[PDB]
Design a protein around this ligand. Structure first.
Ligand SMILES: CC(=O)N[C@@H]1[C@@H](O[C@@H]2O[C@H](CO)[C@H](O)[C@H](O[C@]3(C(=O)O)C[C@H](O)[C@@H](NC(C)=O)[C@H]([C@H](O)[C@H](O)CO)O3)[C@H]2O)[C@H](O)[C@@H](CO)O[C@H]1O
Ligand SMILES: CC(=O)N[C@@H]1[C@@H](O[C@@H]2O[C@H](CO)[C@H](O)[C@H](O[C@]3(C(=O)O)C[C@H](O)[C@@H](NC(C)=O)[C@H]([C@H](O)[C@H](O)CO)O3)[C@H]2O)[C@H](O)[C@@H](CO)O[C@H]1O
Ligand SMILES: CC(=O)N[C@@H]1[C@@H](O[C@@H]2O[C@H](CO)[C@H](O)[C@H](O[C@]3(C(=O)O)C[C@H](O)[C@@H](NC(C)=O)[C@H]([C@H](O)[C@H](O)CO)O3)[C@H]2O)[C@H](O)[C@@H](CO)O[C@H]1O
Ligand SMILES: CC(=O)N[C@H]1[C@H]([C@H](O)[C@H](O)CO)O[C@@](O[C@@H]2[C@@H](O)[C@H](O)O[C@H](CO)[C@@H]2O)(C(=O)O)C[C@@H]1O
Ligand SMILES: CC(=O)N[C@H]1[C@H]([C@H](O)[C@H](O)CO)O[C@@](O[C@@H]2[C@@H](O)[C@H](O)O[C@H](CO)[C@@H]2O)(C(=O)O)C[C@@H]1O
Lengths: 283, 278, 278, 278, 277
C-alpha cells in the first residue's frame, strides 16, 4: 500500500476516546459484592503448584490483555477506486487512572505490625507490568512461558495449545516462531504467555515496561499534558484497516496480601486513550 | 467565548498571582490548641483499620483530601478572558523531615535508642491549574468501604446510592468536581482524563511501606500551561482554580505502630495574560 | 536601582570569585583538639531523643544549620551593579565515605566483625547564590519542640511568641533571612518561594534511615543564574551571598546506636559581570 | 574497504534483515523432552558452588554464554560493501516473569505459603552488531577457577596455559573472538574496547541477589550504528554478526535454595545500505 | 597561555589509547596464586579499628588512585597538544556474574544458595589533563593512623599530624596525583579550586549491600573542551590519565571479611595541535 498526501477539508481530523478496564481474573459479573463482585479489578487468590510437575493455575488467577476495537467512520464508497482514504492514528494521550486508590491502607490486608495485628493494611506492592498499543489491526502476539509444563485450563483462556492444538514444547520457554496469535478478544489472553511480537506489528505501535520483585514499591505518573507520537520514521501512523482501530493494554500494579496464609491478589487499573486521527490518501 | 483570538496588549494586560495551599491530611486547622488536636495539623489522626473483610469504616480525620482554592482575578468585561500561561510551583518544607529527634518509633526498638524514625512510605504529589474546578473520576480499592455520610464527599454523596463493583475500576457514573477544600478523599477521587479540557494537571505516585521520600525544590523551574495549540487554561468568570495534594508518607508512633499521614504545603505563582475571545 | 539596562564593557567588567563553605552539622570549628570535641568537626554531636510526646528538646550541637558567606565584590561607581551570571559548584569529599575501617557499628553484630558501617540515611543538598540574604520560611515537624533560646535562630526568636499549630504547615508570619552562618537549623528554615526574587536556589531531599548516599562531582558543569528575562542576581551594595547545606546521612556508633550527622563542604566559583542600572 | 566513498543508489541498494537470538543460559536446546532436561531450556542448570577457597569447578551447564549469529547478506561484486545503518532490537518475554504460581521458594517460608518467588537478582544485557566477530577481552573474578577443558571456550583454551593473576585485571594477552554460539562464558569474556572498530556494542549490568528485574520493550526505538564520521559497520565478505546476552536474574527452588539463571531471547532488525569503497 | 588557531596539515591530529588497572590494595606482585597474587584486582581483608582512638588501616586494604603519564609526539609561536575528547569504558562487569565461588553464601542457615556477588559502596572517577590531577585532602577521621611508608597521606605532605579541619575543607592539605597506586581515595579528592587544565568526572554510591550498576559501550564520546572551546593543553607533551573504579566488596565465609573489588578502565584520547603564544 502506497501512502500519499494528507486529506484536507471538513472533518478530515477526528479524536476518539475510550477507557479499557483491567482484566485481572475476576470477570465484571456477578456484580454482587458478596458473590465475587468484590474482587472485580483484582485477581482471585493466586493458587500455587503442588509439585515440580503439577502446576495448574486457575483462570481467575491469571491477568489477561485488555483490548477494544473501535469502528471509525466509513471513508470509501467504492473500494475499486485507484486512490482511497484511510484513517491514520497520529498520536495518543494515554493515562492509567486510579493510583490514588492505592493510598487506602485502612483495609483488612496483612497488617504491617504482625505481633499486635496493628500498623496499617499493607498497600499493593510487587511486580508491575504496563503495556499499551494502538494499531490498525489486532496486536500480533508471540507466546513464551516460564514453564512449558504448566497445565493451563483448556477452556476459558487462549493459551499456546489453543493455537497449535498440541502440548507446549521446551522451545516455548524461549522464542518459538510457531507459537503466535493475535489479540482479537478482551480478557482471554494471559499476559504471562502472550507478548507483543516484534517480528510483526508493522501497523501497530506498542510500549511496554516491566518491574519485578515481591515488595517493590509501585510507581506511576499521570498527566493530561503528555502526547505519545504514533508516526513511524517515515512520518506515517497506524493505518486503520476497514476503519478499525485497535487498542490493547495491561496495567498491573502489584499484589495485595491477605491475612489468611499470605494469599496474593493481583491489582490492575484502567487505562484511558484519546487518539487523534487524520485522513490519509493511499494507493 | 469559545473562539480564541489574539493576545491583548497594553497597560495591565499581564498579571501574576501567588498562593499557598496548606495540606488537608485529616486534622482540620482548628482547634488551634497544641494539646486538643492542633498538634496533628499537617498530619492525619491515627489510621484506624478494618475489623473484618466486610467492616471497613475509616474516620474522616484519617483520610487525606484534596486541597483547593478559587482565586479571583482582575475584572475584565468581542470579550477578554484571563489565560493562564505558566506556573512556578514548589512543595515547601522537606527539610522539616530531617527532625529525627522526636518520640516516633525508634530505630533501635530493643533498647529504645537510635533515632526517631523519619517519615517514610507511600507518596503522592498532584497539582492542577485550570479555569474551572478540577473534574474528578471516582475509583476505590473497595466498593464495600463504609465512608461517613457527613464531613466528606464520596461516591455515594454524588450518586445517592451505595458503591457498586464497577467503582473498583472505571465507572463513568462516578464523577464529581473539586469544588471544596478538604472534603474529597484522594483515595477515592482522581483527575478525570476524559474531561479537564480547561485544566492542566500533573501527578505522581510512589507506593510501599518504608520507601524513602524524595523531593526536589527550586525557584528556577517554570511549568508551561499552554496546550498543543498555544492556548492556556481560560478563566471562566475571572476565577482561577488551584488544586493539589502532597503526601510525603507516614510517621509511626511507639504505640501499636499507629501511622499518621504527613502532608506539605504547595506554593503557586501563576502568570496570566488577557486573551481576546469570541 | 530597579531598571536593568545594558551590560558594561571594557577593562575589568567581568570578574570571577571562588569560595568554599564548610558544613555546619552541629560541632563548631573550635575547640580544635581531637580529644576535646574537635574530632566531631564535620559532624553533629550524638542525636538526643525526646523523652515523651510533650518533651522534645534537641541540643544545638545535634542540629545541622545553614552555611552562608557574604563576599565583598570590587567597588563600583547611570549606576552599575554586579550581576551573577553563572556558578560552578561542587560538593567535595564523597570519597572519604569509603572509610569503612573505623569503629562504627559493625555490619556483623553477632561477632562484632565485617566492616565499619558507612554513612547512610537521609540526605539534603541545597545551594543558593543571590544579591541579598536567602529568604527563609519556617516550617517544623512539631510546633511543640522546645528548641534552645540561646545560640540558635528559631521561629520564636523571630516572632517573640511560642510556635502555633500553623507552624507545622505554611504560616506566612514565620519568615527570616539567612544572615548568619551556623545559626539557622535546616529542620526549621526553608527557602521561601514567595520571596527570593534576587536569589537562585536549588535543593533536593532524600529520606529514610539506611538509604545509600549518592553524589556526583565534576569540574565541567556550569549552573546558569540568569532568569527568564536574561538577568542574574544583582548584588546590592556589592555583596554576594552564598548559602548551602550538604547532609550525607548519619554514622552510627557501637554504643546504643548513637547517630551523628555527616556534612561535606561545597565549592562555589561564581562568574559576574557589570550591569548598567537606572 | 579501507577508503569509504559515496552511498550506492538504485534498485536493491537498501536491505533489512531480521533475526532472533535465543538465550544460552546453560541447558542446551536438546534433549527436547520435558522430563529429561528440556524443562530447563531458557535457564541454567542448578548453580554449583566451590567446595573450598582452592576448589571452584563450575559445570558448563551452569554458565551463561554469549549468543551469536552470522547472517549472510545479498551478493555484491571500486567495490561495494554492505553498511549497517541502524538496528531495532528488543528483548522479548518479560511478561512471562509474572508467573508466580509455580513451585519456586515461596514468599512466606515460615508457613510455606504466599506466591512462588519471581525471578530476581543480577541482570546483564549486552548486544552488538558488526561486520566481523565481536572482539573479546578475558577478565575473571578468580584466576584459580577450574573451568572444564571441553565444552566451553575459556582463557586457557586460547593461551594453552593456566590463567595468571593478571587475568583478574586487564591482561592484553587474554583475547578471543566471538565466533561460536553458546560457547564463550559471559563471566570470562567481555567486549574489547581496544578493538571492535567495525562493531557497535551496548551493555549494562545490575548486580545484587534480590534486585527487581527491570525491562522496557517497544517497536518504536531505533539505535543508530553510524560512527562519528557517519559510517556504520562494514560487512566483510557480506557477513553480518549479531551478538547478545540477556540475563534477567535467578529463580530459586525449594531445595537448598538452588539458583537457576533465566535468560530471554533478543530480536534484531538491521537496516543496511550499499556503500562504495576503494 | 594565549591560545591561537588550530594547527593544520600532516600529523596534526593524533589518537592514544591506554588501560589503567585498578589499585585496590594487593600489588601486581607476587604473581603466584598461592602467595597473594590471587588477591590482585582486590584489596586484602579490611581490618577494623580496635577503639575510638586506635584506627590503623593496613596499606593493602586501602584503594588508591590509578594514574599514567603518556608521552605525546615531539612538537617544537609554539605548538601544544590539545586533548579534544575521550572514549572511556570500565571493563569486566560481566565477571561479577561469577556466583559459584566460596564467598559468604546467600542462605547462611544451611550454607547453600549462591556465592554472594560483589555489592556495596561504589566509586567511579576519571580525569584527563595536561598536568597531574590536583588533589584536596579530606578524611572521615583526622585521628586515623595511616602508615608513614608506602602511602601518600596528609602527613606526608604537611610533615605534621592531621588537624580537625582535615575532616572538612582545609586548603593546606593539597597534593598532586604524580604516582600510581599511592594516594588513598578515602583521603584524596579532585580539587575544584585548581585543575584548570584537567577535566574530571566522578560519582559515588554508598551503602553496604547496594547493587552495583555499570553501563559500557564503544559509542560514547566525552568532550573535553571547556566553555571557550579549549581542551586540556599538554605541558611538555605529557598527557595525564587518572581513575578509580570501585565496584563494592566481596564478603568471605570467615567473620564476614570484606575485600574491595576494582575494575580496569580504558581510555582513547583524541588530540590536536594548537598554536599558542
Ligand atoms: C470457595 C472455595 O474453597 N473454592 C475452591 C477453590 O479455591 C479457591 O480458588 C480461587 C482461585 O480460583 C482462590 O484461590 C480462592 O481464594 C479466595 C478467593 O475467593 O479469591 C481468596 C480470598 O482472599 C478469600 N477471601 C476472604 C475474604 O478470605 C476467598 C474466600 O476464602 C472464599 O472465596 C470464601 O468461600 O478465597 C479459593 O478459595 C478451588 O480452586 C476449587 C478447585 O479445587 O475448589 C473450590 O471448592
Ligand atoms: C481519644 C479516643 O480514644 N477516641 C476514640 C477514637 O479513637 C481515636 O480515633 C482517631 C481516628 O479518628 C485516632 O486513631 C486516635 O489515635 C490517636 C490520635 O488522636 O490521632 C493516635 C495518636 O498517635 C495518639 N497520640 C499519642 C501521643 O499517643 C492519640 C492519643 O492516644 C489520644 O488522642 C489521647 O486521647 O490517639 C484514636 O484515639 C475512636 O475512633 C472512637 C470510636 O468511635 O472512640 C473515641 O472515643
Ligand atoms: C559528656 C556528657 O555526658 N555530657 C552530657 C550531655 O550528653 C551529651 O550530649 C550530646 C548532645 O549535646 C551528645 O548526645 C553526647 O553523645 C556523645 C557526643 O559527645 O557526641 C556521642 C558520642 O558518640 C560519644 N563518643 C564516644 C567515643 O563514645 C560521646 C562520649 O560518650 C562523650 O562525649 C564522652 O564524654 O558522647 C552526650 O554525651 C547531655 O546533653 C547533658 C544533659 O543531660 O548532660 C551532659 O553532662
Ligand atoms: C525438580 C528439581 O529438584 N530439580 C533440580 C534437579 C534434580 O534434583 C535432578 O536433576 C534430578 O535428577 O537438579 C538440578 O541440580 C543439578 C545437579 O543435580 C547436578 O548434579 O549438577 C547440575 C549442574 O551440572 C545441577 O546442579 C538440575 O538438574 O539442574 C537442580 C534442579 O533444581
Ligand atoms: C582464603 C582466606 O581465608 N583468605 C583470607 C586470608 C588468609 O586468612 C591468610 O592470608 C592466610 O594466612 O587473610 C586475609 O586477611 C588478612 C590478614 O590475615 C592479615 O593479617 O592482614 C591483612 C591486611 O593487611 C588481611 O586483613 C588476607 O590475606 O587478605 C583475608 C582473606 O580473606
Amino acid at each position: 500500500m502506497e501512502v500519499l498526501d494528507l486529506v484536507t477539508g471538513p472533518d478530515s481530523v477526528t479524536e476518539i476516546e475510550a477507557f479499557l478496564n483491567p482484566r485481572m481474573g475476576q470477570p465484571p459479573t456477578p456484580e454482587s459484592l458478596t458473590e465475587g463482585g468484590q474482587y472485580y479489578g483484582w485477581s482471585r487468590g493466586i493458587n500455587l503448584a503442588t509439585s515440580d510437575t503439577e502446576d495448574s493455575p486457575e483462570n481467575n488467577t491469571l491477568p489477561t490483555w485488555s483490548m477494544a476495537k473501535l469502528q471509525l467512520p466509513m471513508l470509501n464508497e467504492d473500494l475499486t477506486c485507484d486512490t482511497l482514504q484511510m484513517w491514520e492514528a497520529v498520536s495518543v494521550k494515554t493515562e492509567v487512572v486510579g493510583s490514588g486508590s492505592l493510598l487506602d491502607v485502612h483495609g483488612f490486608n496483612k497488617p504491617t505490625d504482625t505481633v499486635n495485628t496493628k500498623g496499617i493494611s499493607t498497600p499493593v506492592e510487587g511486580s508491575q507490568y504496563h503495556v499499551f498499543a494502538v494499531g490498525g489491526e489486532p496486536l500480533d502476539l508471540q507466546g513464551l512461558v516460564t514453564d512449558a509444563r504448566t497445565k493451563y485450563k483448556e477452556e476459558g483462556v487462549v493459551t499456546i495449545k489453543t493455537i497449535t492444538k498440541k502440548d507446549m514444547v521446551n522451545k516455548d520457554q524461549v522464542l518459538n516462531p510457531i507459537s503466535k496469535a493475535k489479540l482479537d478478544k478482551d480478557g482471554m489472553y494471559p499476559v504471562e504467555i502472550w507478548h507483543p511480537d516484534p517480528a510483526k506489528n508493522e501497523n501497530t505501535r506498542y510500549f511496554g515496561n516491566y518491574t519485578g520483585g515481591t515488595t517493590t514499591p509501585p510507581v506511576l505518573q499521570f498527566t493530561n499534558t503528555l502526547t505519545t507520537v504514533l508516526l513511524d520514521e517515515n512520518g506515517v501512523g497506524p493505518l486503520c484497516k476497514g476503519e478499525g482501530l485497535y487498542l490493547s493494554c495491561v496495567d498491573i500494579m502489584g499484589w495485595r496480601v491477605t491475612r489468611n496464609y499470605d494469599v496474593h491478589h493481583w491489582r490492575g487499573l484502567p487505562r484511558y486513550f484519546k487518539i487523534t486521527l487524520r485522513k490519509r490518501w493511499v494507493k
